[PDB]
């Protein structure tokens, strides 16, 4: 289906936050377009 196809070409997890050792936790300040994830 579309989820398997997107995953096979590198489609990334639906993530709202990342942690970086310099900045700490960092998050989207507004909802990211859904289709992007």
């Amino acid at each position: 289906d579309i989820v398997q196809h997107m995953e096979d070409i590198g489609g990334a997890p639906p993530v709202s936050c990342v942690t970086n050792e310099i900045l700490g936790v960092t998050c989207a300040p507004q909802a990211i377009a859904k289709a992007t994830x």
Binding site: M6, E7, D8, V18, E21, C27, Q30
Partner: protein, 388 residues
């Protein structure tokens, strides 16, 4: 045998920087070499250990505002996509911020060079290390082991983390080219290197930052002037033009050859089915002027284990830059050049000739010219020619 390019530790170490299956170990054109679990789903992850010089992702958005066709633009907000309509506007850049509004990306090299956590010795290494030191959080806000790829902009001195790890999107059932078909959510995109544009961009997996000084001695970062890559067979160095599966094309410039080592249809790639190339592919090539004065490009999948001297040639790889000289942003704050590894002195490095290869009627000659090792195939002696 008696391959001069395998003759001693230092020479072997030097030639090993060209083996993209050894250190890089993943796809080049598309790098998706690893799989990582986030929230119970497995995702593909860029994994290669070498930076890919000049690599950028070219987008096919409509040619109009608000579309900039630039992968380094922030990923689109849901409100932006509502305003643009299809396809998705914006680019691949991670737009996240700390609570006070500091952006993770792009991040200024000027801050990385004065930070105690950042240990890398070069600016490229510091960008790569910043990427390595960034991990996705899952739906429970726990760190995972999934890491986004990065692009270093060495012109602006900015470190980008890409929220989009996809590198190739194609097929009219999934993506539009310049807004056609207009119903599709995604625009098409693909990796590119260009004869003129974006040489200052360097794309890599976050895993380039895992051991962030390693790429300096283990990756073929720069083009190699003055030599054609070859393989050692029947007692002599055969450059790619002597190999059957070699692809040879006329080109108008050396730069076009560099672009072909990355763009040709056999380059190591992990793109679908989830292939893991492991860095195996037609990743190697050289520009040369043939005996009749035509500029040509020879491309091969054979990892080089010797070199043929040719002052008008330049050997490239899919990973490395067009540049033939070490740029300032990869010189440690504190690894021998080709000139150093290939150095000789005439009175310490006598001419040697190997045995006639009677199939080609040629023999190896290894000598010192201009303080540098020469390696060529020359005619056999008169008696030897009897045996041909």
């Amino acid at each position: 045998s008696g391959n001069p390019f395998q003759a001693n530790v230092e020479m072997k170490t030097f030639m090993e920087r060209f083996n993209l299956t050894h250190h890089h170990q993943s796809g080049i054109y598309v790098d998706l070499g690893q799989d990582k679990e986030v929230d119970g789903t497995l995702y593909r992850e860029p994994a290669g250990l070498c930076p890919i010089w000049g690599k950028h992702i070219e987008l096919q958005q409509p040619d109009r505002p608000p579309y900039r066709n630039n992968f380094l633009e922030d990923v689109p907000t849901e409100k932006e996509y509502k305003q643009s309509g299809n396809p998705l506007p914006g680019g691949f850049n991670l737009n996240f911020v700390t609570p006070s509004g500091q952006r993770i990306s792009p991040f200024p090299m000027e801050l990385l060079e004065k930070n105690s956590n950042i240990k890398a010795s070069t600016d490229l290494g510091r960008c790569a290390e910043f990427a390595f030191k960034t991990v996705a959080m899952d739906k429970n806000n726990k760190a995972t082991k999934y890491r986004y790829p990065f692009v270093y902009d060495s012109k602006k001195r900015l470190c980008h983390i890409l929220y989009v790890s996809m590198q190739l999107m194609e097929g009219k059932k999934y993506c539009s080219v310049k807004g056609e078909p207009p119903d599709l959510t995604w625009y098409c995109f693909k990796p590119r290197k260009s004869v003129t544009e974006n040489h200052h961009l360097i794309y890599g997996s976050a895993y380039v930052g895992e051991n962030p000084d390693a790429f300096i001695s283990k990756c073929p970062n720069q083009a190699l002037r003055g030599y054609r890559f070859g393989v050692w067979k029947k007692g002599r160095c055969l450059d790619y033009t002597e190999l059957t599966d070699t692809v040879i094309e006329r080109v108008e410039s050396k730069a076009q050859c560099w672009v072909k080592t990355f763009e040709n249809d056999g380059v190591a790639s992990d793109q679908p089915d989830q292939p893991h190339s492991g860095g195996v592919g037609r990743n190697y090539g050289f520009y040369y002027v043939d005996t009749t004065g035509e500029g040509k490009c020879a491309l091969s999948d054979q990892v080089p284990d010797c070199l043929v001297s040719d002052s008008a040639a330049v050997s490239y790889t899919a990973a490395g830059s067009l540049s033939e000289e070490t740029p300032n942003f990869i010189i440690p704050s504190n690894p021998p050049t080709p000139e150093t590894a290939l150095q000789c002195t005439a009175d310490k490095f006598p001419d040697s000739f190997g045995a006639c290869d009677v199939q080609a009627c040629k023999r190896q000659k290894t000598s010192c010219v201009g303080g540098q090792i020469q390696s060529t195939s020359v005619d056999c002696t008169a008696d030897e020619q009897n045996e041909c």
